[PDB]
Design an enzyme around this catalytic site. Structure first.
Site, PDB file in Angstrom:
ATOM      1  N   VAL A   1     -20.190  67.261  97.475  1.00 26.26           N
ATOM      2  CA  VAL A   1     -20.771  68.228  97.900  1.00 26.26           C
ATOM      3  C   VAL A   1     -22.078  68.672  97.348  1.00 26.26           C
ATOM      4  O   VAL A   1     -23.205  69.180  98.312  1.00 26.26           O
ATOM      5  CB  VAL A   1     -20.040  69.507  97.878  1.00 26.26           C
TER       6      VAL A   1
ATOM      7  N   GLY B   1     -26.221  63.761  88.819  1.00 22.40           N
ATOM      8  CA  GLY B   1     -25.861  62.705  89.914  1.00 22.40           C
ATOM      9  C   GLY B   1     -25.203  63.055  91.050  1.00 22.40           C
ATOM     10  O   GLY B   1     -25.761  63.604  91.893  1.00 22.40           O
ATOM     11  N   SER B   2     -23.907  62.803  90.840  1.00 18.63           N
ATOM     12  CA  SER B   2     -22.826  63.119  92.049  1.00 18.63           C
ATOM     13  C   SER B   2     -22.042  64.057  91.772  1.00 18.63           C
ATOM     14  O   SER B   2     -21.695  64.483  90.538  1.00 18.63           O
ATOM     15  CB  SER B   2     -22.039  61.736  92.731  1.00 18.63           C
ATOM     16  N   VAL B   3     -21.964  65.314  92.637  1.00 22.41           N
ATOM     17  CA  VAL B   3     -20.936  66.301  92.312  1.00 22.41           C
ATOM     18  C   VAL B   3     -19.778  66.490  93.550  1.00 22.41           C
ATOM     19  O   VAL B   3     -20.280  66.207  94.594  1.00 22.41           O
ATOM     20  CB  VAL B   3     -21.913  67.713  92.573  1.00 22.41           C
TER      21      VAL B   3
ATOM     22  N   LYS C   1     -18.953  67.696  88.286  1.00 19.27           N
ATOM     23  CA  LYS C   1     -20.403  66.965  88.174  1.00 19.27           C
ATOM     24  C   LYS C   1     -20.299  65.784  87.328  1.00 19.27           C
ATOM     25  O   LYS C   1     -19.834  66.123  86.152  1.00 19.27           O
ATOM     26  CB  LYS C   1     -21.425  67.632  88.041  1.00 19.27           C
TER      27      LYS C   1
ATOM     28  N   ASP D   1     -29.554  74.236  88.502  1.00 25.25           N
ATOM     29  CA  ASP D   1     -30.385  73.129  88.365  1.00 25.25           C
ATOM     30  C   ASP D   1     -31.884  73.760  87.661  1.00 25.25           C
ATOM     31  O   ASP D   1     -32.680  73.076  87.755  1.00 25.25           O
ATOM     32  CB  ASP D   1     -30.933  72.270  89.531  1.00 25.25           C
TER      33      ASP D   1
HETATM   34  C1  LIG Z   1     -21.284  71.220  88.439  1.00 21.76           C
HETATM   35  C2  LIG Z   1     -22.744  71.716  87.914  1.00 21.76           C
HETATM   36  C3  LIG Z   1     -23.315  71.163  86.761  1.00 21.76           C
HETATM   37  C4  LIG Z   1     -24.342  71.345  86.363  1.00 21.76           C
HETATM   38  C5  LIG Z   1     -25.197  72.440  87.194  1.00 21.76           C
HETATM   39  C6  LIG Z   1     -26.737  72.869  86.882  1.00 21.76           C
HETATM   40  O1  LIG Z   1     -27.144  73.985  87.443  1.00 21.76           O
HETATM   41  N1  LIG Z   1     -27.050  72.328  85.517  1.00 21.76           N
HETATM   42  C7  LIG Z   1     -28.546  72.898  85.123  1.00 21.76           C
HETATM   43  C8  LIG Z   1     -28.694  72.626  83.681  1.00 21.76           C
HETATM   44  C9  LIG Z   1     -28.758  73.928  84.446  1.00 21.76           C
HETATM   45  C10 LIG Z   1     -24.628  73.026  88.175  1.00 21.76           C
HETATM   46  C11 LIG Z   1     -23.470  72.692  88.619  1.00 21.76           C
HETATM   47  N2  LIG Z   1     -22.943  72.888  90.001  1.00 21.76           N
HETATM   48  C12 LIG Z   1     -23.629  72.430  91.107  1.00 21.76           C
HETATM   49  N3  LIG Z   1     -24.487  71.381  90.963  1.00 21.76           N
HETATM   50  C13 LIG Z   1     -24.983  70.698  92.277  1.00 21.76           C
HETATM   51  N4  LIG Z   1     -24.638  71.269  93.478  1.00 21.76           N
HETATM   52  N5  LIG Z   1     -23.660  72.097  93.580  1.00 21.76           N
HETATM   53  C14 LIG Z   1     -23.090  72.570  94.830  1.00 21.76           C
HETATM   54  C15 LIG Z   1     -22.300  73.615  94.526  1.00 21.76           C
HETATM   55  C16 LIG Z   1     -21.527  74.492  95.535  1.00 21.76           C
HETATM   56  O2  LIG Z   1     -20.664  75.585  95.178  1.00 21.76           O
HETATM   57  C17 LIG Z   1     -21.686  74.183  96.919  1.00 21.76           C
HETATM   58  C18 LIG Z   1     -20.474  73.844  97.506  1.00 21.76           C
HETATM   59  C19 LIG Z   1     -20.574  73.364  98.942  1.00 21.76           C
HETATM   60  C20 LIG Z   1     -21.928  73.148  99.623  1.00 21.76           C
HETATM   61  C21 LIG Z   1     -22.962  73.553  98.636  1.00 21.76           C
HETATM   62  C22 LIG Z   1     -22.906  73.963  97.556  1.00 21.76           C
HETATM   63  C23 LIG Z   1     -22.280  73.835  93.046  1.00 21.76           C
HETATM   64  C24 LIG Z   1     -21.698  75.072  92.128  1.00 21.76           C
HETATM   65  C25 LIG Z   1     -23.164  73.016  92.309  1.00 21.76           C
END
Ligand SMILES: Cc1ccc(C(=O)NC2CC2)cc1Nc1ncnn2cc(C(=O)c3ccccc3)c(C)c12
EC number: 2.7.11.24
Length: 326
Positions: free
Chosen positions: A27, A28-30, A45, A158
């Protein structure tokens, strides 16, 4: 207290996750992973070669640090962090678990309500207030790293890490106001459905950005520092500041006022995240008693430029020590 893990080859990589989590789709790779423990949809992630360069090892310690520190309703939070590694010398993989929201603000664009723009922009700015209060700049805020559910609860992804020049602040293409330019660029698009500056080249963007805001005046041409920045501004045609109303047809007068103040080239005179909340446009959403600030983040590790092996061990301890929040 170590549980049991499991492998799966996806998109040319091996996801090694504990039993606690199931089903993994990109939805590196998540991965979009379904939790069996709380029965929720968590975000899983797996990082891009975490320690295969010195910067990767630093961008890994920082990310994990930034996450084990931020605690705000509009800012992504860490639920879990894990390693398939049993020891320290076997530790080469890092997993970060958050909450998974519906989609992003790029996906919710469409003709938007002024009250629906009011509620998203307020959430972005309130999220930046808690990020900025811990001395952190996003530097690449686009609607893609602004995740939203079904109820429009917003969370910023991010922050503090980093066709593409669309939302970048003029002075950076230094100051927390870099994200305020991006906020205006998103808000303009939400109010209509049209990218305010959809430029292709680095130079063209600056010509498109100065087409609306005007050319830097006598006051700013003195304030400006860089030779190439000075010798490019004087090389491009004289442009006056355009009336926002003429482009922002039908839009709420308080929405046209905020954007005019948000999209100014002057960093010393650009509206702050805290200042923009008390603005007339967000009179319905603002409440000074429930607008939190951030508990000091130990940013002392930045002035250090040590070796891969040292970064890895620091990252190693923050994984072991991690206490899962309720
Ligand atoms: C798992 C994760 C790890 C780190 C960080 C992040 O900020 N670290 C930065 C240092 C601040 C953010 C995440 N989490 C996401 N990181 C990327 N992509 N992502 C898509 C979603 C959705 O909920 C979503 C679901 C379906 C479609 C689109 C979006 C979510 C919650 C994430």
């Amino acid at each position: 207290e170590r549980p049991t893990f499991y492998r799966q080859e996806l998109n040319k990589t091996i996801w090694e996750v504990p039993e606690r989590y199931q089903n993994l789709s990109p939805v590196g790779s998540v991965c979009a992973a379904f939790d069996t423990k709380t029965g929720l949809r968590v975000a899983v992630k797996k990082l891009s070669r975490p320690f295969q360069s010195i910067i990767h090892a630093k961008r890994t310690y920082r990310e994990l640090r930034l996450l084990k520190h931020m605690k705000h309703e509009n800012v992504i939070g860490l639920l879990d962090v894990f390693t398939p590694a049993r020891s320290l010398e076997e530790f080469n993989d890092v997993y970060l678990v958050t909450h998974l929201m519906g989609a992003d603000l790029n996906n919710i664009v469409q003709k938007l309500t002024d009250d629906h723009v009011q509620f998203l922009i307020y959430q972005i700015l309130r999220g930046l207030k808690y990020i900025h209060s811990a001395d952190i700049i996003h530097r690449d805020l686009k609607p893609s790293n602004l995740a939203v559910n079904e109820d429009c609860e917003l969370k910023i992804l991010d922050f503090g890490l980093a066709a593409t020049r669309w939302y970048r602040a003029p002075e950076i293409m230094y100051n927390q106001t870099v994200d305020i330019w991006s906020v205006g660029c998103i808000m303009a698009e939400l109010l209509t459905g049209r990218t305010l500056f959809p430029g292709t080249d680095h130079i063209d963007q600056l010509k498109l950005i100065l087409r609306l805001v005007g050319t830097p005046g006598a006051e700013l041409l003195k304030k400006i520092s860089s030779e190439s920045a000075r010798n490019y501004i004087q090389s491009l045609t004289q442009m006056p500041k355009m009336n926002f109303a003429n482009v922002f047809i039908g839009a709420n007068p308080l929405a046209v006022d905020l954007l005019e103040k948000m999209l100014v080239l002057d960093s010393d005179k650009r509206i702050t995240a805290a200042q923009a909340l008390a603005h007339a446009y967000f009179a319905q959403y603002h409440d000074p008693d429930d607008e939190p600030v951030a508990d000091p983040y130990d940013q002392s590790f930045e002035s250090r430029d040590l070796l891969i092996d040292e970064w890895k061990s620091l990252t190693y301890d923050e994984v072991i020590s991690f206490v899962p929040p309720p």
